[PDB]
Each structure stands twice: as structure tokens, then as C-alpha cells.
Design an enzyme around this catalytic site. Structure first.
Site: not given
Ligand SMILES: [Fe+3]
Ligand SMILES: [Mg+2]
Ligand SMILES: [Fe+3]
Ligand SMILES: [Mg+2]
Lengths: 423, 423
Positions: A60, A316, A310, A153, A214, A211, A58
């Protein structure tokens, strides 16, 4: 070309082993009764640990490497991260996405990662990042098998043309169908979005990675729908619930009931220790919850769970070098998997369990499999983890694709002494 | 002998700097307008970061390196740790303590740590570990200034002759008076033990470092007595409250009232991220608290707080390589000090703030101070932390006492490429 890997230690096995290679595959694995001499065409593991490649289940890659551009996230909050990313919009181009994705992929290759699943934002009518990532997937294929998740997203039902864009992403080649039920406007949209996600996965024969929950909301229970739909369709192996941080806040009675379904469904779980400890618990004052899903209990129940990084160097999560042993180190601490055996077996959370999550069909040190393996300069999983060792050699298709010459530390006492951090 | 450190970056400063050395001290520090050429007697920092030595404000060298001897702690719990340690009793000798303490001290020297405060169990009529540690202190002096805390692990009033043994430890040379109020049989014994601790510190002119409120009990408030007594005696600078993990569980109103006193008292605080995240929250099911003291709030209030490793490779914490950047990494995550500036300023938590905690009088890159400094192959604190860089050079008294040749990583793509994990 390499013909043999000698003096190899294997997890859960006693002694040393010899791994014979032929035509890019593992032809046979034989135990040794002692140390074998090196020779031409032999890669000496030097009694180090040999394991199948590390896996990143996982990440991005569409946002990676953007921290500080044009400004830094000073509060470190999710909110500010969104604003900092928005300020960089003018730089988000096809070439920019490819350049940054490749930068992190190179760090992953260096870190013995040969399998990566990246989520790509598809809540963009232009699908800019997706088009770029599809090219990256082809370009990096000789070193990494990259899976692309079409990640809506902004929601499927809560964003204009969200469902149409998700399907368009699949028609363009995305390997996995994503979703984000807790971000939808309502619980009803959340549940409905999952039915749509499963319908798309069955229509296109793709995997699923949601996702899921979360959020530190004890009422966020979309995971039960993910598991129930997987069980109904008999497709647990192809399904993954990422995050499930809300599970950290569920009462025990519901969790116990839920676990029966989780086991029966056969779905996979991904926890992301570095980011979860950072972003969860932000609405608590003190005490503050950890916010990681129930990893220890999943392991005890035989439910497949693994760890992802992640995010790497973005708004982030500003840190990271895309190192799985570092991710594992954080997870063992936060999940309190600190017994010797728990730590030693920790490697499974970044190797075999992750391969299962990606539904890999050619993975593991076994005769017949492609010769994809890495060598760690450590005695076992515990040692590798404690010393945060680099990957000495990464082998793919029977060829070395990465190598790290270890650092050399010396202390100058009455006489110079080499320090290797072993007792 | 070395005469200059050139091309040095300094935290919070712009550009490059030259540090002139003379007679084992820093004679002057001058800014450079560009890169200086290397030459004989010049140590080139190569635009790396130069900082005073890392500090270990809280470690237990008497128990270090004993994990797995004779058996491993499989549950990872405190309870089992106590049992595993007891099984090794037959090996606890003078020479054994010295050997293990030296092993960890060598790792610390290699990691640029020149100041260490070790707690030593003095709830032992034979004071075996203490006698051994006092010799180690003398032996390691050329490389590390070691402070010894007489730590009455079983309590002062709750253990036979506890107070007499604590005083005997001071008469033998222990530098710091320890205590553990929450472990005493009653709250009254806890408070009384602190009065006795302060009386001993004033009688012998020693520092104080209390294992304070290391328990997830919202009613454990011994920290207010530690701060009040320090304020009364006007000795805040010489006092430290280690752990204070109970503070993670206090209500906000009491904490706000308490903070006024903490600031006025001037006492120091040590948080031990790696061990606290592991041992705290063990009585919670889910959600699970983090259990680290209020580091972020202390920093915001100007209260001195720093990080210690606590334990290395023992029954209570099986991991570690005695690396302060690793301790810092864990603390930034668990305490959510993840904004760019918070991470960059993180180095203070393992350098300057820790030096203050140890009441050091010769510390910092300033003219007149001893030439004790280390060079990190990184641009700033953020970079050093993100990449977990080793210490390129450790200098003490103007001489190199440790050096690490960095690892060299190469990925073999269409062409070989060096990977340094920088963008
Ligand atoms: Fe993610
Ligand atoms: Mg995230
Ligand atoms: Fe301690
Ligand atoms: Mg302790």
C-alpha cells in the site's frame, strides 16, 4: 554496455553459468566448466546467485511512510491505526502521496524489486491518492513496472457511489480491479460485490486482486466465489485472492473440498506474513492462532501462492525496509516451511510465483527476455535467506540500476579476523 | 587507549551523552548540550545509540553448526532432527565441539554479544561436550563471559545415572543446574527432578535454568514448582524457567492465579521466538497456535522475561547468524508487541532483562562498571530494530573488540543516490 554476466549460480541448477546480453535482452545462457576471468563489459557474479528480480505483489504505497505522523500508534492495534491515520488527514495531498510512494519505491529499487503491485484506496470521491499514484507509475517506469489496484477500501456496495468510483478508477487507468467482500455490510453484499468486480474486469480487460477473507472468521468463504467466477470466465491467470487469512481457521473437510476448485480455477494467492502475524489472532486470548493462509498446503497442491510485504512504516505496520528476503524469512517460520529444501525453494515465493500473480509476460532468466536480473552474494536460496544478504547488483535492460557494497565485519581476537557468517 | 565515547544517545534519555573511561571502567557519564568534536582517544558514536552488550541467555553451542552433516533435515521436524543428529555421531569429538562452538561464538562477538549462557547435554557418561565447552569457556573469556548449564537432556530420573551425571557436571565446573521435567517419564518424576535440581543448586551455590514445560500440553505446569521452590529458598534471582511454551495453552483463570506466584518468586523467564514459532504448534492442524510463552503479560506484570536464540544452524533450527536484533524482531511480531513504545523498549528483552536472567553483577552504562558497551548506528531501539542494524563497535574493558563498516547501497536514477532506509 554490459555484454555478459559470468560465474553465475542458478536455482535448481548445477555449476556456474554465463548469461550473454545483447540489445537489452538475454541472448543466450551457457554453462561454464570452471570459473571465468573477469574483463571489460563483464559483470562478475562471483559464484553468487543470479535470479530474475524480486517482486512485491502486495503493498500500500498510498499509506506508506506515515507512521508517527502526527502521533504514534502506541497499542499497535488496527483500531488505533485507523485513528492515527485520521489525525494526519490535513497532510494527505497529491504531492505528499507522491513523495512517500517514491521513498518506498527507492527502497524497493535498492532491494532488487523491479515489479510492484500497489493497492490504492478508491473509496474517496476526489481520488487523490489514485491521481498521484498514476503519475508515480509513469515516473518510476525506468526502474519499476508498477501495477495499480483500484482498492475500494470501504466496500463497493457498502460505501456511497462505491461501484461508480471503482469504475472511474479503471477509466483513469488502474491496472487491477480490487474488492473487499468480508468488509461489506452483509454476506449478500459480499457475494454481489464479486460479481460486479468480475464484470468490470471483463468490461475493461483488467486483472483482479481481491482483499479476500482477511478476518479470523471461519464463515468467511468469499474465496470460493472468487475461484468459481474465475473458472466460469476462464480467467484464473488474471485473478488473485490476497490474504485469505480466514482459511487458517476453516475446518479441514471444507478446505479439502475447496482445494479442488482452487486448483481447477488457476487463481493466484498472496499471503502477507509480516502483517498477518501482527494483525491476525487479535481476538484470541490464549492460545493465539497464527492467522496466515494455508501456504504449505497450497505449495503441496501446486496452487500458486506468493508473499507480499503489504505495508511499510505506516499505522497498520510500523516496521519494514521493503525487503522481500525479510518477508520470506517471516513466512517460512510462521508457515513452518523449515526443511532445508522448503527454505531453499523459498525464493520462488518472492520471485517466480509473484511474477505469475502479476501475470508478467517478460520475466525469468531465459533467452529472449529483457535483461532484468539481480545478483545475490550467496550460494543458493537457503544461504541468501539465512544471511539476509543484500542485493549486490540489480540489472534492468542490461544496465546496473542498483548496487550494494557489503558491510565489512571484523573481530579483534589475538589477530583481526573477518567475519562473513558462513561456516 | 580510548578515553571517551562521545555523541552517544542512551535509551529513555534525551539528548547526547559523553561516557568517560578510565582503567577499563566507566568513570563518569555527562550530558552534552550539543555535538562534540572528535579527537584522539575519542570513539565517536555519531549520535548512534550506546547500550550495554547484547546478551544470549539461551543457546546450544554443543549442537551448533551441524545442520546438513551428513544429511539435511528435509521435513524440518523435531523427529527428523533427532535422526539427522544421530547420523553425525561419528564426528562428535572434543575438537569438533570446540571448533563449532568457537565458530558461533565468533559470530556472537561480531554481533556485540559479550555474555552467553549455553546449555550442554550431560546425559552422556563420557561428558564429551561438557569437557570441550569448559575449555572453550576459558579460551573465549577475553571477549565473552560464557556460562555453562549442565543440561540433562534425557531427564534426571528417566536416564541411567542421570542425577549422578548432573552432579558430576557441577563438580567439573558447570555454572548452572539444568532440568527438563516435562520430558521425564511421569509427572511425579518431573516434580521430583525439580527438588533434586534445587538441592544441587544450593549444595554447590549455582544458578538454575530449567527447560520448563516446552510442550503444547495445557497440563504441563512444572513452572509452578520451579517458582514455589525458588520462593521457599529465597533464591528467585538465581532461577530461570526457559521456554514455558505450555503457558501459551493454559486457561486464563489458572494463569492469573499462577502469575501472583511468578511475581512473588522473582524468577526469570526466557522465550526463544525463532525456535518456538518453528517447533511449537506442530500437533495442531488448523488453526495453529503460536506457542510462545506469555511475554506481553509478563512485561505488563513486571515479571522478568527476555529472548534467546536457542539454536543456530543445527538439526533443530537450520537458520540463524546468532543475531539478537533478529531474535527480537521475531518475538515482537509473534507476541504482538507492535506498538511504537513496545518495539522501542524491545531492546530491554535482549540487554538488561537478559543480564538479570544471567544474574550479572557488572552490567550497564554506569559509573564504576567495566567499560563494556556497544554502539548501534541508529537513533533508538525502534530504528535499530526496524533497520536490523549491525553493531558499529563493540567495546570491552575499554577496548574495541569488534567493528562493522556498514554496507553502502546506491540506486542509479537520473543521478546516483545513496539509500540508508531512513525517511
Ligand atoms: Fe492490502
Ligand atoms: Mg491491509
Ligand atoms: Fe534449549
Ligand atoms: Mg531445544
Amino acid at each position: 554496455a554490459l555484454q555478459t554476466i559470468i560465474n553465475a549460480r542458478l536455482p535448481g541448477e548445477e555449476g556456474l553459468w554465463q548469461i550473454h546480453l545483447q540489445d537489452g535482452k538475454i541472448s543466450a545462457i551457457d554453462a561454464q566448466s570452471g570459473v571465468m576471468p573477469i574483463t571489460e563489459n563483464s559483470l562478475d557474479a562471483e559464484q553468487g546467485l543470479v535470479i530474475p528480480p524480486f517482486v512485491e505483489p502486495h503493498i500500500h504505497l498510498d499509506t506508506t511512510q506515515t507512521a508517527g505522523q502526527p502521533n504514534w500508534n502506541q497499542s499497535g492495534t488496527l483500531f488505533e491505526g485507523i485513528e492515527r491515520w485520521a489525525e494526519r488527514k490535513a497532510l494527505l495531498t497529491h504531492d505528499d502521496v507522491k513523495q512517500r510512494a517514491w521513498q518506498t519505491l527507492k527502497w524497493q529499487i535498492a532491494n532488487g524489486i523491479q515489479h510492484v503491485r500497489t493497492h490504492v484506496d478508491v473509496s474517496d470521491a476526489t481520488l487523490t491518492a489514485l491521481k498521484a499514484m498514476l503519475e508515480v507509475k509513469q515516473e518510476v517506469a525506468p526502474w519499476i513496472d508498477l501495477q495499480i489496484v483500484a482498492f475500494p477500501q470501504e466496500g463497493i456496495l457498502s460505501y456511497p457511489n462505491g461501484e461508480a468510483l471503482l469504475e472511474e478508477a479503471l477509466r483513469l487507468g488502474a491496472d487491477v480491479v480490487g474488492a473487499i467482500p468480508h468488509f461489506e455490510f452483509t454476506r449478500e453484499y459480499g457475494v454481489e460485490s464479486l460479481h460486479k468486480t468480475f464484470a468490470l474486469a471483463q468490461k475493461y480487460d483488467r486483472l483482479i486482486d481481491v482483499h479476500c477473507d482477511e478476518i479470523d472468521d471461519e464463515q468467511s468463504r468469499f474465496v470460493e466465489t472468487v475461484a468459481a467466477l474465475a473458472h466460469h470466465e476462464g480467467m484464473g491467470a488474471r485473478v488473485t485472492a490476497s490474504h485469505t487469512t480466514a482459511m487458517h481457521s476453516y475446518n479441514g473437510a471444507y478446505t479439502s473440498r475447496l482445494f479442488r476448485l482452487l486448483k481447477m480455477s488457476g487463481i493466484n494467492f498472496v499471503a502477507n506474513p509480516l502483517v498477518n502475524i501482527h494483525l491476525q489472532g487479535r481476538f484470541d486470548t490464549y492460545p493465539k492462532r497464527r492467522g496466515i493462509t494455508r501456504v504449505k498446503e497450497m505449495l503441496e497442491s501446486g496452487i500458486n501462492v506468493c508473499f507480499g510485504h503489504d505495508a511499510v512504516f505506516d499505522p497498520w505496520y510500523p516496521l519494514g525496509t521493503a525487503n522481500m528476503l525479510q518477508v520470506l524469512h517471516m513466512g517460512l517460520h510462521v508457515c513452518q516451511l523449515m526443511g532445508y529444501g522448503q527454505i531453499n525453494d523459498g525464493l520462488n515465493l518472492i520471485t517466480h510465483h509473484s511474477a505469475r500473480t502479476l501475470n508478467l509476460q517478460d520475466y525469468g532468466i531465459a533467452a529472449g527476455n529483457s535483461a532484468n536480473l539481480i545478483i545475490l552474494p550467496a550460494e543458493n536460496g537457503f544461504d541468501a535467506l539465512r544471511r539476509q544478504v543484500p542485493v549486490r547488483y540489480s540489472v534492468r535492460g542490461g544496465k546496473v540500476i542498483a548496487s550494494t557494497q557489503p558491510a565489512q565485519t571484523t573481530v579483534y581476537l589475538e589477530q583481526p579476523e573477518a567475519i562473513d557468517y558462513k561456516r
